[PDB]
């Protein structure tokens, strides 16, 4: 029971400074341990960034030595990360962690996206089998969701009245914006005879696009 919690902006434009705070409770950042920043890149690789010890000494990973600064505020029981000149390869999840008996206590992580993009509603293209390929027992439909920002769309098939094989595929960066797809499998006689409708919500842009799926 030693708690750490990260806070700060989760969106930073390139060449600005990423800045974050770790807030410690139930133990003093003056009193013991090194107090660390570790980041996890997309695809899951981990990188140790640096620390400031309980006596205020810092160590930084040479890989970031010229653009990193770690500080603290002993009276708020807080330490801080600042990471200058960020580019899109600084998109990662940031953790603050105590070293000492290994790495026992971790914050909950905060993802920080480094992007120049503006809020953009998605384009939603329905995915229906091209005629000719006559099918078997089940039929697979989908929706392609292209050119949105920031991340977090939600694709609801009917009212959710379907998770008969609803697959959601992780978004990828494509052209500065995000693309994801969703699939839904249904019996080959439930469609096209029934309405299959994919509703795509992008709350950041206050937009929802419904596509009803059409044969041929």
């Amino acid at each position: 029971d030693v708690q750490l919690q990260e806070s700060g902006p989760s969106l930073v434009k390139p060449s600005q400074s990423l800045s974050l705070t770790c807030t410690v409770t139930g133990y003093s950042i003056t009193s013991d341990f090194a107090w660390n920043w570790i980041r996890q890149f997309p695809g899951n690789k981990l990188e140790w960034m640096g620390y400031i010890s309980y006596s205020g000494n810092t160590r930084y990973n040479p890989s970031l030595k010229s653009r990193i600064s770690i500080t603290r505020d002993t009276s708020k029981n807080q330490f801080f990360l600042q990471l200058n000149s960020v580019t899109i390869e600084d998109t990662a999840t940031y953790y603050c962690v105590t070293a000492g008996r290994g790495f026992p206590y971790w914050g909950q992580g905060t993802l920080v996206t480094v992007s120049a993009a503006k809020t953009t509603p998605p384009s939603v293209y329905p995915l229906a089998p091209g005629c000719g390929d006559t099918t078997g027992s089940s039929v697979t439909l989908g929706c392609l969701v292209k050119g949105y920002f920031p991340e977090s769309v939600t694709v609801t098939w009917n009212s959710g009245s379907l998770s008969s094989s609803v697959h959601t595929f992780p978004a990828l960066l494509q052209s500065g914006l995000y693309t994801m797809s969703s699939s839904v499998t249904v019996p080959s006689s439930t469609w096209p005879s029934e309405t299959v409708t994919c509703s795509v919500a992008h709350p950041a842009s206050s937009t929802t696009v419904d596509k009803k799926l059409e044969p041929s």
Binding site: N44, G102, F103, W106, P126, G130, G132, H167, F169
Partner: protein, 214 residues
């Protein structure tokens, strides 16, 4: 920098199994290594420090040991919460560095992918783009390769793939592969082919369409 090589990079296992994960450093680290668990979606928990010592709140079915450049983690009688990713980390010398992780995944039976290919939609074509989508759904194991062909010719540029995490109800994997082309190039070729090479078959599962039909 000390390089941490973790073996294996994934593992398919069942509740009750014992699992053993190893770590190799490029240099002797004299037991200055720890072990970490990241549950899926979640943050980290420190398991082991100094090669062999348990952190507080860590059940005794977790154990480690090693010497020199070689150390392992053992988890005995796997429980459902134990399905997670595990990393070693060396702190013998700065910078501190991590292995690439071992994902513990759930064992199931081999399953073939249901492969579906879709032509660009008009609407997309309207805007000057043409994405050809191919879902390869509900397969096991997670190892799979996807090959695109345009008029017989194999195509690598413009392909983007996206994999789901192991499914929470059936324990299979899915991928989408998308081949993005200009509407211009698209209208210049007839046959679009998506081939899935998987363990459950000696031969690719092929799916195709012709631009010119219908």
């Amino acid at each position: 920098d000390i390089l941490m090589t973790q073996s294996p990079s994934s593992m398919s296992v069942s509740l009750g199994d014992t699992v053993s994960i190893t770590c190799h450093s490029s240099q002797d680290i004299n037991s200055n290594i720890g072990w970490l668990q990241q549950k899926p979606g979640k943050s980290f928990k420190g398991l082991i420090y100094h090669g062999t010592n348990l952190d507080d709140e860590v059940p005794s079915r977790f154990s480690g040991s090693g010497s020199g450049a070689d150390y392992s983690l053992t988890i005995s009688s796997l429980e459902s919460e134990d399905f997670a990713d595990y990393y070693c980390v060396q702190y013998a010398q700065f910078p501190w560095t991590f292995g690439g992780g071992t994902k513990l995944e759930i064992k199931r039976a081999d399953a073939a992918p249901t492969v579906s290919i879709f032509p660009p939609s008009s609407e997309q074509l309207t805007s000057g783009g043409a994405s050809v989508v191919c879902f390869l759904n509900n397969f096991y194991p997670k190892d799979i390769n996807v090959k695109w062909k345009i008029d017989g010719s194999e195509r690598q540029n413009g392909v983007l793939n996206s994999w789901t995490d192991q499914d929470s109800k059936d324990s299979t994997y899915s991928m989408s592969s998308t081949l993005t082309l200009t509407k211009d190039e698209y209208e210049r070729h007839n046959s679009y082919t998506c081939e899935a090479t998987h363990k459950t078959s000696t031969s690719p599962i092929v799916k195709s369409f012709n631009r010119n039909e219908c």
